[PDB]
Structures are given as C-alpha cells and as structure tokens.
C-alpha cells in the first residue's frame, strides 16, 4: 500500500476547506460547501500505480495550538497555505506556520500554497484591499517567501475555478517521491 500523509496548515483567511473539497469532489460552483473537510484519503493514479493520498486539514484555531502538533507524526509533505488576498495570512506563513511545522518536523518537505488566486484580480476585492492600504500578494512575493522558508515549491491556486489546483497535489506527491 503506497500511502502518503499530506498535512495542510494555514490561517482561516485561507479557505482550507474549499481547497480540499474542490480537489476531492469537483463540486460545481454554487453547491453547498460544509464548514470543515472530513480528512478522508483520496486514491490517485501515479504512473500506472495506486497512491493513497491522505489529506489532513488541521484545527488552525489558537486554542488548539498545544494539541495541533499531535497531527504531525509521520507526515510525508506539508502544504503551508495563505490567501493571496490576505497579507496577514501571508506574514503568518513565516511568523507562525513555518516555525510550528519545523519545530515538530525538521526535514519534511513544505509546499507553499497561495489560495484565492481568482480574487487577486477581482475588481471588487482589489478595490476593497486598496481602501485599507493593502495589495494582494504577487507571484514574486510568494516565490521570495518560499525561498525564505525553504519550501520545495511555490504554487498558486483557486478552489473556485481549479486553476493551479491539480498541480498542488501533483507536486505534493512528487515532493515525497523526491
């Protein structure tokens, strides 16, 4: 049984639930999306062989800080996520998630994932952030953060349109095969 444990960390701005629901169901835009993903594995085809892709969201809330790391043993690959339209969630990649992952799992490969790619050039969202002295995270800014935390890849995706979405999971698998 070829089995990969992929753990997802990131703030509430990220849409971790939509990311994992969109990937595992390919539900149509407009369908009811639950509050939490249920952390069930997905079987995926890699070079004519079955791979069991264990997909775990973590309980990101600060009151679960002490116990969240019990999710981390034997993790094969981490997706550290931020929203491209939340600078605070991007700074929490290096301020919170990277140090937390590295405390428990010094050597496990990290993929840096920017989500909500579909909003980075939504007129109403660009206007909204403008009014607060903010700008969406750009591709080069993301790449720089990936180098800073020693991520093996930086990828950007949209749960809504599935632009970039398959590549995140393809690269997660590739990172564990090396």
């Amino acid at each position: 049984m070829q089995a990969i444990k992929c753990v997802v960390v990131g703030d509430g701005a990220v849409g971790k639930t939509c990311l994992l629901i969109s990937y595992t169901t390919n539900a149509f835009p407009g369908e009811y999306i639950p509050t939490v993903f249920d952390n069930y594995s997905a079987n995926v085809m890699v070079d004519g062989k079955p791979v069991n892709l264990g997909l775990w969201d973590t309980a990101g809330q600060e009151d679960y800080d002490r116990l969240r790391p019990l999710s981390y043993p034997q993790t094969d690959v981490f997706l550290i996520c931020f929203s491209l339209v939340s600078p605070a969630s991007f700074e929490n990649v290096r301020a919170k998630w990277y140090p937390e992952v590295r405390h428990h799992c010094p050597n496990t490969p990290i993929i840096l994932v920017g989500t909500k790619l579909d909003l980075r050039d939504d007129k109403d969202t660009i206007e909204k952030l403008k009014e607060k002295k903010l700008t969406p995270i750009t591709y080069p800014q993301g790449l720089a953060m990936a180098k800073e935390i020693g991520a093996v890849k930086y990828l950007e995706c949209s749960a809504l349109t599935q632009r970039g979405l398959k590549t995140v999971f393809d690269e997660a698998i590739r990172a564990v095969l090396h």
């Binding site: 701005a13 639950p34 509050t35 939490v36 309980a59 809330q61 009151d63 002490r66 116990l67």
Partner: peptide, 27 residues
C-alpha cells in the same frame, strides 16, 4: 488533560474559521 482539552476546543472554539462545532452552528 489532552482528551478534555481536545473535546472542549473542537466543540467550543469561538475563533472565526475554527474547526469546531461552534463554527458549524454559526453556518
């Protein structure tokens, strides 16, 4: 201690975006 805290936080965490029954109840 770990079970009591895990159950309390995953039922009752009030943080916006929490993995908790309190957030499901908000939805």
């Amino acid at each position: 201690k770990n079970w009591q805290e895990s159950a309390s936080v995953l039922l009752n965490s009030q943080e916006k975006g929490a993995v908790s029954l309190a957030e499901v109840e908000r939805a």
